[PDB]
Design a protein around this ligand. Structure first.
Ligand SMILES: Cc1cccc(Cl)c1NC(=O)Nc1cc2ccccc2cc1C(=O)N[C@H](C(=O)O)c1ccccc1
Ligand SMILES: Cc1cccc(Cl)c1NC(=O)Nc1cc2ccccc2cc1C(=O)N[C@H](C(=O)O)c1ccccc1
Ligand SMILES: *Cc1c(COP(=O)(O)O)cnc(C)c1O
Ligand SMILES: *Cc1c(COP(=O)(O)O)cnc(C)c1O
Ligand SMILES: CC(=O)N[C@@H]1O[C@H](CO)[C@@H](O)[C@H](O)[C@H]1O
Ligand SMILES: CC(=O)N[C@@H]1O[C@H](CO)[C@@H](O)[C@H](O)[C@H]1O
Ligand SMILES: Cn1c(=O)c2c(ncn2C)n(C)c1=O
Ligand SMILES: Cn1c(=O)c2c(ncn2C)n(C)c1=O
Lengths: 800, 811
């Protein structure tokens, strides 16, 4: 097999890259290897499509505006069982596979957790043999490349397709028209949506290999193209051709907002674009099937469509439009079938994230969908009036339309009424969703609302990113854990095995040494090998409280400066993440962190006790490097704000201990591992509510806590910005008068908890014993467990 | 060519079938149960490209190892057409691929018809570049084509309510299996900014950057081991406000390579066009210099790289003035970047460049406003001014008392808005200037650039155009190619002058019938196409009378239309009188902004409607406006043609190349003594062409006298009738005034003297009809045309450029 891989590599270099080795580039070698690897899954890819056609399993369609896929080469090698043989083949060719792997651009087609969940799910669904396709947009530009210039974030275009993508296949044959604008006529042959502008949707297919099985599923991503046909309704010829750019702009760039709604028309076009192309494709495949007594009675027995957040909410009225206006089904039948087809996953309760589209905007762009939405709402409110004749406010609360001045469509409400199942993403969150946020809806339909706790794939997030740990675990308990991560509980038998604990520590140490080389190469800071790696990587947000971590960094710095001879447990503090470009406070927080880092790293009285890195361009491939090197994972969102989290799970699986609040899935991590094996601190959700009731006065904490006062005064008075002493005035103002996330209220408990972490870190046996308990309890957080639950309780499909 | 018989030939076919199936599977990722005809086309295309990779690599190695002098053909246009069949033929793989595809149960014609034209040109100029690439590869020259990878080539033409409409030519929609992107050779191109004159010298600063990403297409020689390269540049925004809008605004940089300017023989001074011209020049020159420095002739001294040997290792041909900015750009690189003394840099520049002039029509001449150039390319304006100053200083020295000569010879047109005469820039910056046919090159030398050729009497040359006999005989007319080979062997393909051996069959009635049979087969096949696309019943015994070329006043499709109406009126006047039946086909694109050309199309379609539907005419006369004329369609209609219409006003068509294609493929020519028509008459004998009308001196005499169109209208009853019908609404009854603009032009503003050639043209046409009634005489004349067409091989043309301009040797 090694010999044939080398032969295949050389054939691709020659015929595919059209290069003699004398003038080949590193990129050429990457592409030759990529093609060699892709070739190994084509047979199963084709045979999987045949199998689904032949056997007609119910299909699952995961519809998302985001797929945060990272790099594909190593993941594909691992899932096909080819990694070791490819490593050896490339070595024999006089190359280094790790160098080739670094050439590949991330498919950064998402913002954070939501998009990464979609990615993990694809992997899990393929590994479980489900007839599942991911449907999304092939953005020409993904999440921006982040650079730091003078300590500030600057954005560069993520031109990930510049040199091509060997992991996609365009299928222009399957191109479909999407309509916009136009007008509606209610004719005696049905409602017609006419005089529209057309944009074509060209699909690109990327293979999704199951881990060591026969399944290769598909991620189909749509790209926007201008139509070619002359219309009699049709100026400068050259400008007309250039203006084709306007249609093509629909798939140009991912909106870089994490947990934040921006009601831009282009974003609405993206949402409808993906929905319209996807539903047409699904219906085409259904009609071509052996199920293709009218045509669509079997549709929800053959089709499940999962809505990833409310971003593809328009799928609901689009399916109704197709059923009623095109296929001529009665409204009642169409609506029955629609509800049985769709399920909706809610990912946040933060109000700034909620999608509320102005009715005037929807009327202009999608007049027929607005009609359909108004009719869904009418039939919905008619029911509520029937059940609660007197409750006028309940009608207001439950309407899909918010009438308060500027009328807006509540897309979450649309998703709830149009779906048979609604789930949150962690127990704490799903409860809030059910019993608070959508109380009025769950009361009327109790069985609709569910929980499906998030998860992560142990292929990318253990086998790939941490082969040392994966190997060590395999050596002790075999490799069944890869496909059933609950098998990690067997590691509990090795508590008290001191040789094993040393082996476990050595794996972490090797990871840290490797990541330290990266850090020294990229940042030219000298890393203390014996320091605790204290890491907070996630999107920059007020709710995630990178700011709270920064206060702790400054607290540590001041303690060292005040007592230089005192025992200090050394740390490398790493904070990274992107800020949404329009998010002013997040950008200020990045500048604060880089400003602190500059002072701390260059103070000769501090030296190797404490180094601070703002980790630039945080993304999936970089997550894979830092996570395995981490000792302490920071998961410190205000209680009630992080729906689940998944970075938390990645760190747990990779041998880090967690400092965190009782928020999102942190709560379930504590349940699985034991609360005493996490560093839990701070206000619980009820404590936060009590402070809201009483009223939050940040000044009181600043006055009462001397260490906080010095930290805040330093920030406020130019200690970290001597050339611009008032630089951080907006942060200070926010902290004292507009802090929705109560940073000062958790500061004391946070610092005391951090003190306990440092104490435990001085005791390697105790530390590593606690680590083992975390790894051994991490099995619940496999996305294979998550997908099995969706399959059984939402989609009604069986792993195969 | 590769055998399909015996042990080895069976294996050749077997390997091709295996490769096809491998590509369908691994490349297209399709089970045959779901494969489309397009999938099969791509699987074959990939297979065929695989078969030239070895030679392509070994060609590059050979040029590196032996360092022959390289020829770089720099053009804004490469009108390449389809590549699959051309490549199969040149590699000797057509028979084997045909057999493989047949054994797979597929129709290779259907697969071939899937391919989009690479329509990256407007007409003759762009197609000449394409023929040249084929010939340069066939002759083993170390030659690359350099151009722009337009996302959209020449628009697709449709006819709606009788008018041209344009659709975007989205030729890359399904991908291009021929090209290979080369990311690592990306180069920056600079725009705007300003010039700083400092202690360290002149710097061009504060510029905007656009990246140029090259894509390589293989250019296989006919039956040799050479595969040359066509490198086409694509514009990208650099890597490095509303964030979203900043990302969308990257479209502005990428717009530089978005679309081919669809003007044929017409200058439109648009800023985007100037950007295109600089883009291709800047990326190309950087790439050429990089290759030179990497070569065995690359060496460094105290200043750095010695460029002394540069013009011994590099020739750059400027296809028209479109890449004229190459001259000041090479000077900019030499002087500003490499720090060469101006004098030395200018000497090297002149020895490197040669310029081909393609037209003397004034509306075609590039004259860029200096203010536009100052804005976009401020350093190039400075360099152009300095070239002009030193140029005029020499003229002052030689002709101290001739002030008007300075005005005439300046690169700058000073009157009103100052403009740069790009032709003048090309002449002074080049060591050789050539026109494209004897008559044209003489006008260029002795009239248009008289002041320059007097000063430098050896600079000016002629290189008569040619066409490749691969695409334009072997490929498009296999029936004729086979017949010729049966009679005289297959050595004509590489030495087309061997066609004179066909004179052995003068008076051989068996051969003359064979020639007619080939034409008839072509006509029947093409008639099937016409009846599928058009509501017409084609008379299979009719003469196919064809005028296909871009729509222009100078090319006089309008004159042809007057003859069509004349024929119609004769039939109506005397329905029982004998009439030699014709199918009149006129085709070509109009530039979208060219009002008169668009009116002429509408006239032709309006006439067609009347003629085709008049029951008194019936099968005597049918008229077709052939839509979307382009290279692949030219390959179909040309071999089906009996009479080739080449009727430009004397002095206006620099050469023409359609004329040559028709001659090679067994049509007789009706034409004026213009461009290469004059040379076709020389080769075949003037008595074997239907030559008519004013010659160039007659046109000059009429200009001097003053042209009064109404005199012809009053003197020629048949013309009067035609014009009155057009003017009065006979061809536009629902809109009687529709053709007012055509009538006004013809009477008061006709620079091309349509009425002045009408009488001679119609009389000449009468002679054609008479000959067509005598198949033996007709086909005897055809034989004499085919037999004399050897001069018009572009292999002959390229050998002359090689010897007399580039100083390179066929290998
Ligand atoms: C087939 C082909 C066509 C165009 C360009 C390339 Cl890069 C390729 N591939 C390729 O293999 N090129 C060469 C192979 C060689 C093999 C042995 C010895 C020399 C070789 C040179 C090339 C080659 O194309 N070199 C390019 C060039 O001549 O354009 C060279 C390389 C680096 C900088 C400048 C030019
Ligand atoms: C690997 C792959 C992934 C996605 C799409 C395709 Cl077209 C391919 N290639 C492919 O060969 N697909 C199929 C092969 C089959 C072989 C035997 C029997 C049935 C097969 C079906 C497919 C296939 O993908 N068909 C598509 C589909 O299921 O998406 C089908 C075809 C035409 C209209 C609608 C759907
Ligand atoms: C896992 C992951 C996330 C989500 O992290 P959280 O801490 O749960 O917000 C975001 N970005 C990347 C690149 C990830 O891999
Ligand atoms: C050969 C050719 C031309 C040039 O034709 P002329 O009659 O010489 O102007 C123009 N267009 C196409 C498609 C051609 O093949
Ligand atoms: C709208 C949005 O991006 N929500 C995010 O979704 C992911 C995946 O469910 C959660 O882990 C995270 O807590 C939450 O902030
Ligand atoms: C500017 C331009 O396109 N000129 C054209 O060039 C071709 C190629 O030489 C000639 O055959 C033709 O007569 C001439 O009109
Ligand atoms: C105020 N604000 C923003 O303005 C913002 C954002 N994310 C993106 N943007 C622009 N978030 C989370 C936010 O709170
Ligand atoms: C007047 N005119 C035009 O306007 C024109 C053209 N070709 C393109 N355009 C726009 N020609 C040849 C022309 O003579």
């Amino acid at each position: 097999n090694v010999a044939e891989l080398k032969k295949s590599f050389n054939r691709h270099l020659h015929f595919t890259l059209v290069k003699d080795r004398n003038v080949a580039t590193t990129r050429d070698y990457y592409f030759a290897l990529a093609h060699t690897v892709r070739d190994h899954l084509v047979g199963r890819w084709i045979r999987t499509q045949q199998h689904y056609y032949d056997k007609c399993p119910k299909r699952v369609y995961y519809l998302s505006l985001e797929f945060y896929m990272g790099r594909t080469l190593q993941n594909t090698m691992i899932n096909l069982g080819l990694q070791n043989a490819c490593d050896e083949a490339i070595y024999q060719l006089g190359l280094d596979i790790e160098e080739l792997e670094e050439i590949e651009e991330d498919a950064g087609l998402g913002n954070g957790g939501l998009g990464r969940l979609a990615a993990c799910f694809l992997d899990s669904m393929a590994t479980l043999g489900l007839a599942a396709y991911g449907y999304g947009i092939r953005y020409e530009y993904g999440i921006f490349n982040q650079k730091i210039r003078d300590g500030w974030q600057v954005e560069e275009a993520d031109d990930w397709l510049r040199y091509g993508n060997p992991w996609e296949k365009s299928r222009p044959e399957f191109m479909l028209p999407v309509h916009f604008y136009g007008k509606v006529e209610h004719t005696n042959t049905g409602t017609k949506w006419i005089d529209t502008q057309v944009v074509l949707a060209l699909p690109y297919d990327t293979p999704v290999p199951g881990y060591m099985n026969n399944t290769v599923n598909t991620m189909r991503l749509w790209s926007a193209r201008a139509p070619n046909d002359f219309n009699l309704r049709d100026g400068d010829y050259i400008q007309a051709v250039l203006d084709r750019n306007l249609a093509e702009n629909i798939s140009r760039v991912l909106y870089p907002n994490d947990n934040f709604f921006e009601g831009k028309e282009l974003r609405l076009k993206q949402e409808y674009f993906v929905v319209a192309a996807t539903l047409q494709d699904i219906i085409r495949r259904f009609k071509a099937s052996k199920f293709g007594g009218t045509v669509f009675d079997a549709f929800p027995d053959q089709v499940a469509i999962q809505l990833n957040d409310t971003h593809p909410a328009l799928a609901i009225p689009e399916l109704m439009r197709i059923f009623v206006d095109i296929e001529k089904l009665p409204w009642s039948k169409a609506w029955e079938l629609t509800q049985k087809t769709f399920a909706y996953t809610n990912h946040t309760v933060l109000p700034e994230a909620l999608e509320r589209w102005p009715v005037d905007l929807v009327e202009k762009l999608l007049p027929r969908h607005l009609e359909i939405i108004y009719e869904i709402n009418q039939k919905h409110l008619d029911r509520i009036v029937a059940l609660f004749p007197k409750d006028v406010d309940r009608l207001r609360r439950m309407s899909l339309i918010e009438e308060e001045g500027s009328k807006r469509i509540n897309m979450a409400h649309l998703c709830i009424v149009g779906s048979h199942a609604v789930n949150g993403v962690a127990k704490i969150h799903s409860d809030i969703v059910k019993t608070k946020v959508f109380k009025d809806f769950s009361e009327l339909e109790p069985d609709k609302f569910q929980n499906k706790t998030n998860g992560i794939t142990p292929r990318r997030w253990l086998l790939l990113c941490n082969p040392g740990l994966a190997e060590l675990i395999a050596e002790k308990i075999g490799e069944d854990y890869v496909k059933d991560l609950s098998q990690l509980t067997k590691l509990h038998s090795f508590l008290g095995d001191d040789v094993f604990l040393r082996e476990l520590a050595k794996v972490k140490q090797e990871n840290k040494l490797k990541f330290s080389q990266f850090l020294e190469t990229e940042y030219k800071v000298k890393i203390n090998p014996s320091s605790m790696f204290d890491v907070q990587v996630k999107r920059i947000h007020e709710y995630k409280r990178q700011l709270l971590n920064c206060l702790h960094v400054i607290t540590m710095y001041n303690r060292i400066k005040k007592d230089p001879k005192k025992l200090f447990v050394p740390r490398t503090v790493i904070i990274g993440g992107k800020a949404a470009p329009g998010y002013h406070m997040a950008k200020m927080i990045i500048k604060l962190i880089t400003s602190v880092a500059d002072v701390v790293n260059n103070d000769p009285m501090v030296g190797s006790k404490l180094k601070v890195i703002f980790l630039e361009n945080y993304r999936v491939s970089l997550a894979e490097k830092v996570i395995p090197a981490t000792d302490l994972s920071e998961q410190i969102s205000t209680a009630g704000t992080e729906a689940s989290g998944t970075g938390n799970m990645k760190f747990m699986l990779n041998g880090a201990l967690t400092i965190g609040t009782m928020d999102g899935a942190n709560v379930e991590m504590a349940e699985e591992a034991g609360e005493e094996n996490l560093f839990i601190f701070g206000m619980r959700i009820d404590d936060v509510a009590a402070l809201d009731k009483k009223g939050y006065e940040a000044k009181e904490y600043y006055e009462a806590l001397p260490e906080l006062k010095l930290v805040i005064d330093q920030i406020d008075n130019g200690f970290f910005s001597p050339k611009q002493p008032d630089l951080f005035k907006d942060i200070i103002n926010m902290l004292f008068y507009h802090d929705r996330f109560k940073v000062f209220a958790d500061y004391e408990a946070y610092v005391k908890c951090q003190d306990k972490v440092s104490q435990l870190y001085m005791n390697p046996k105790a530390w590593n014993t606690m680590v083992l308990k975390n790894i051994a309890a991490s099995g619940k957080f496999s996305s294979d467990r998550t997908i099995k639950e969706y399959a059984q309780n939402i989609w009604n499909v069986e792993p195969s």
